[model samples]
Target: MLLDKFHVDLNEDMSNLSFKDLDIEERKRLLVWQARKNLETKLQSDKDLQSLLT
Candidate 1:
């Protein structure tokens, strides 16, 4: 939804993870962008998610 129109672009490269990697169920859990950073922070602290991503 926010992929267009209202947004910001850093014109920079990023890595680590992406929301696209989530399954439909996980994606369904995603709604408000407010929790975006919260989810990333949790994933970073979680060795399991990190390892799983790897």
Candidate 2:
């Protein structure tokens, strides 16, 4: 079920973990886990951007 886009360079790097070392279902779960961090980062960045606009 791996897609070609999943082979792109830095995909694994950006994700910060090796899926090969973990269960496929767990890999999917960890990706969702990382989504929380990603969302928080975006929220902080948005706040920083808004502060600069003021």
Candidate 3:
């Protein structure tokens, strides 16, 4: 499930982009952004995978 994959433990009151600083909305946005970037990288590597498969 997306919720399980997105779960993170955040330290309270920490600065500099700590997970605790994110509200529910922010967490959802962050997760979506991360997943999109990850998928793009995977798509770009298709040629590498094809070479290895030969």
Candidate 4:
């Protein structure tokens, strides 16, 4: 499960940030960038695990 592989805590109060206030292009770019960072971190961690296993 991806959720299990990448554990994260959800903030119920994120609605307070008013995402609707962001320009559509800015919001989409931010979301994509955040996902890319998350994936990069996960891949790095997985590589570290492989090194430890060997």
Q: Spell out the clash pairs found in candidate 2.
A: none
Task: Give the per-residue lDDT digits (tens) of candidate 2, residues 4-54.
Answer: 333332243436677778888667656755665576577776976557657
A best-first ranking of the candidates according to their lDDT comes to: 2, 3, 1, 4
Across residues 1-54, which tens digit of lDDT does each residue of candidate 3 receive? 553555532322222354477898766756655665566578677887556657
Error of 3 at 1 (Å): 17
Where model 1 places Cα greater than 4 Å from the true spot, the runs are 1-30
- lDDT against true structure, model 2: 0.57
lDDT of 4: 0.50
The best candidate by lDDT is 2
Global Cα RMSD, each model? 11.7, 9.5, 9.7, 10.3
Residue 26 of model 2, lDDT score: 61
lDDT of 1 at 41: 81
lDDT, residue 7, candidate 3:
55
lDDT of each: 0.51, 0.57, 0.56, 0.50
Ranking by TM-score: 3, 2, 4, 1
lDDT of 4 by residue, 6-47 (tens): 342232122233456768754554454456556656877797
Residue 17's lDDT within candidate 1 is 37
TM-score of each: 0.37, 0.48, 0.49, 0.45
